[PDB]
Design a binder for this molecule. Structure first.
Ligand code: SF4
Ligand code: SF4
Length: 80
């Protein structure tokens, strides 16, 4: 899964992009639920939140180096 840096500007521009509602608005920065973040697998080819993030603050979470299989499985548990 991914997570948000402290460079987050809280522009909120990423919430729409997320297909799993894994981003929660915070203060000073936003927080991603590693439980809901499938890195967009099962939805897109690239994580959508990054495509609109100006601060470039959504790195890979070393605490959760999941596999596409795992990620794909996480995706389903959330929708179908
Ligand atoms: S789009 Fe980037 S800066 Fe803006 S809230 Fe999301 S993570 Fe932070
Ligand atoms: S990488 Fe995809 S799944 Fe994870 S937080 Fe961003 S938009 Fe949601």
């Amino acid at each position: 899964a991914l997570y948000i840096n402290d460079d987050c500007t809280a522009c909120d521009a990423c919430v729409e992009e997320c297909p799993n509602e894994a981003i929660t608005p915070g203060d000073p920065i936003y927080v991603i639920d590693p439980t809901k973040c499938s890195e967009c697998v099962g939805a897109f080819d690239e994580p959508q939140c990054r495509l609109v993030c100006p601060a470039d603050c959504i790195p890979d979470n070393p605490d959760y180096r999941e596999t596409r299989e795992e990620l794909q499985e996480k995706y389903d548990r959330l929708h179908g």
